[PDB]
Design an enzyme around this catalytic site. Structure first.
Site, short mmCIF file in Angstrom:
data_model
loop_
_atom_site.label_atom_id
_atom_site.label_comp_id
_atom_site.label_asym_id
_atom_site.label_seq_id
_atom_site.Cartn_x
_atom_site.Cartn_y
_atom_site.Cartn_z
N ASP A 306 0.70 -0.90 -0.30
CA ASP A 306 -0.04 -0.36 0.01
C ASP A 306 0.71 1.45 0.25
OD1 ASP A 306 0.33 -0.22 2.66
OD2 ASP A 306 -0.17 1.32 3.30
N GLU A 307 0.29 2.22 0.06
CA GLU A 307 1.01 3.64 -0.63
C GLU A 307 2.56 3.75 -0.72
OE1 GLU A 307 -0.28 4.92 3.57
OE2 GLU A 307 -2.07 5.68 2.15
C1 LIG Z 1 -3.57 0.39 3.62
C2 LIG Z 1 -3.24 1.57 4.53
N1 LIG Z 1 -2.49 1.43 4.54
C3 LIG Z 1 -2.47 3.58 5.24
C4 LIG Z 1 -2.21 3.28 6.64
O1 LIG Z 1 -0.77 3.06 7.23
C5 LIG Z 1 -2.52 3.71 8.04
O2 LIG Z 1 -2.72 3.79 8.37
C6 LIG Z 1 -4.13 3.89 7.81
C7 LIG Z 1 -4.73 4.92 8.82
O3 LIG Z 1 -7.06 4.75 8.44
O4 LIG Z 1 -4.64 4.22 6.13
C8 LIG Z 1 -4.17 3.60 5.22
S1 LIG Z 1 -4.42 1.87 5.09
#
Ligand SMILES: CC1=N[C@@H]2[C@@H](O)[C@H](O)[C@@H](CO)O[C@@H]2S1
Ligand SMILES: [Cl-]
Ligand SMILES: [Cl-]
Ligand SMILES: [Cl-]
Length: 499
Positions: A306-307
């Site tokens: 993610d991200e």
């Molecule tokens: C998969 C995700 N990656 C992120 C996390 O690093 C954060 O902690 C969270 C906070 O709500 O939001 C998104 S969910």
């Protein structure tokens, strides 16, 4: 008399809503001489002892567990249409019998039994009772096989005992998987022998700075063992290639420019990335996954994904192409956040969708397409099951990037037709993640976890036909005295007619 109701709780008044409830006849009453009869097997006795431990404090009864005689409470393993997790619970003056094909089933039956008993059962000292169990029969089986709760121990570290406490909180609602976010930008929480600094340095702090922490292998094994005793399959997560600052800060060689970034103590995301161009990156990943796999008796290994906003789409795809096989190499099934759906999920993989209503069609389509291609789907919408999301603009803890999520919103939906164009059979289940950017102690976890936690468990367990907010909120409302008696703080949502 909230703690000691004049009469027994309805047989159908349990969460998750049982698949089938057939009340009738008189209830069973546990008395000082009640024995817990189990089969003559270690696993059977294990469940018996577990049950005994839950009841002894409040009843003040001996409640011996034996493999002989006709105990008033019988736990028996036998053939039947209950699968690996279902069970049947029969209650009447003749006693209470929980039947299932496997221990997990008996365990789940026990979780139902503790709700059938009165609130006083949560106390630690002898209580009047009465210890009544509504009469009738319950035949219960799960809708989805993937019903998990995630705990982020990277943003704020939580020790073994605190994790054991959370495990007990989730075990109440038949969750069967415990996803642990073991690493992120603010910390690395698992000792890796081949890369010692990840834990000693990368685990040295957390959000807000100050002491951090991490699990030695012994501590991690104890968490897995305890989770297993609560029939929770532990799904460890080592997020990559993004959310990797703790690792990057620990080994300069992991950074593309060969320089180690400072340890991160903020609460933002998206700036870190493993070096997709270096060979050492993959030795590192191989070592970590290899050691993690050895500590994971469970079937899955979560690699996040993610991200990874500092990772060009092309590099992300290349990275995932190379790392996914490593998971299978060590005999595990890979799990990733839904961004993995855009990087060619390998066969057998599952992706965890964390989008929300405002998520665009193109993104949702990519996930639904992966489902079509055989990828399993785990649903954990940020505006639905994220326990760290604020209830309203006034909630003191939590985040609000995904908007506000009250109790009804968290519960009022169907996983089967949630994602547009996604085959219902591709939905493996749901997950309630609890991120800890803003939570640093067990009580805060409870406040943000309850009362939404039970609801997500129901979505994963109960039949779609039993789903209904108006009737569910009554069942949820009934939990108040139990939680109060157990010392479990929770948000008293105005949407719930609290008992
Ligand atoms: C998969 C995700 N990656 C992120 C996390 O690093 C954060 O902690 C969270 C906070 O709500 O939001 C998104 S969910
Ligand atoms: Cl608990
Ligand atoms: Cl920051
Ligand atoms: Cl951010």
């Amino acid at each position: 008399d909230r703690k000691a109701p004049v009469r027994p709780t309805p047989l159908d008044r349990v969460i998750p809503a049982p698949a089938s409830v057939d009340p009738g006849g008189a209830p069973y009453r546990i008395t000082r001489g009640t024995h817990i009869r189990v089969d003559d097997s270690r696993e059977a006795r294990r469940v018996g002892d577990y049950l005994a431990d839950l009841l002894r404090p409040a009843t003040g009864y001996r409640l011996p567990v034996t493999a002989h005689g006709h105990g008033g409470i019988r736990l028996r393993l036998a053939g039947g249409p209950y699968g690996d997790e279902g069970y049947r619970l029969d209650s009447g003056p003749a006693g209470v019998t929980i039947t299932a094909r496997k221990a997990a089933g008996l365990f789940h039956g026990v979780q139902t039994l503790r709700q059938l008993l009165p609130p006083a059962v949560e106390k630690d000292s002898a209580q009047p009772g009465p210890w009544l169990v509504a009469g009738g029969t319950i035949e219960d089986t799960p809708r989805y096989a993937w019903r998990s709760a995630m705990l982020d121990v990277s943003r704020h570290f939580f020790g073994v005992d605190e994790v054991k406490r959370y495990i007990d909180r989730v075990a109440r609602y038949k969750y069967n998987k415990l996803h642990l976010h073991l690493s992120d930008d603010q910390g690395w929480r698992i000792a890796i022998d081949s890369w010692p600094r990840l834990a000693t340095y990368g685990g040295s702090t957390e959000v807000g700075g100050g002491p951090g922490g991490y699990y030695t292998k012994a501590e991690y094994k104890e968490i897995v063992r305890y989770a297993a005793s609560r029939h929770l399959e532990v799904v460890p997560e080592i997020d990559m290639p993004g959310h990797t600052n703790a690792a990057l800060a620990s080994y300069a060689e992991l950074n593309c420019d060969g320089v180690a970034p400072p340890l991160y103590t903020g609460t933002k995301v998206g700036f870190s990335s493993l070096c997709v161009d270096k060979d050492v990156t993959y030795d590192f990943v191989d070592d970590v996954i290899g050691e993690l796999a050895a500590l994971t008796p469970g079937r899955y290994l979560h690699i996040g994904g993610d991200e990874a906003h500092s990772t060009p789409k092309a590099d992300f795809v290349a990275f995932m192409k190379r790392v996914q096989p490593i998971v299978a190499k060590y005999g595990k099934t890979v799990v990733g956040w839904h961004q993995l759906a855009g990087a060619e999920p390998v066969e057998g993989a599952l992706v965890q969708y964390w989008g929300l209503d405002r998520t665009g069609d193109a993104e949702k389509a990519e996930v639904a397409e992966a489902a079509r291609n055989g990828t399993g789907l785990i649903l954990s919408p940020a505006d639905r099951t994220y326990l760290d999301m604020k209830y309203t603009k006034d909630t003191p803890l939590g985040l609000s990037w995904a908007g506000y999520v009250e109790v009804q919103r968290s519960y009022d939906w169907d996983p089967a037709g949630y994602l547009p164009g996604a085959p219902a059979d591709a939905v493996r289940g749901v997950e309630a993640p609890l991120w800890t950017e803003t939570l640093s102690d067990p009580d805060q976890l409870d406040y943000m976890a309850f009362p939404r936690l039970p609801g997500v468990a129901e979505l994963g367990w109960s039949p779609a036909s039993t789903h209904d907010w108006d009737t569910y909120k009554v069942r949820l409302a009934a939990q108040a005295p139990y939680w109060e008696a157990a010392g479990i703080d929770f948000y008293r949502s105005p949407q719930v007619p609290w008992t």
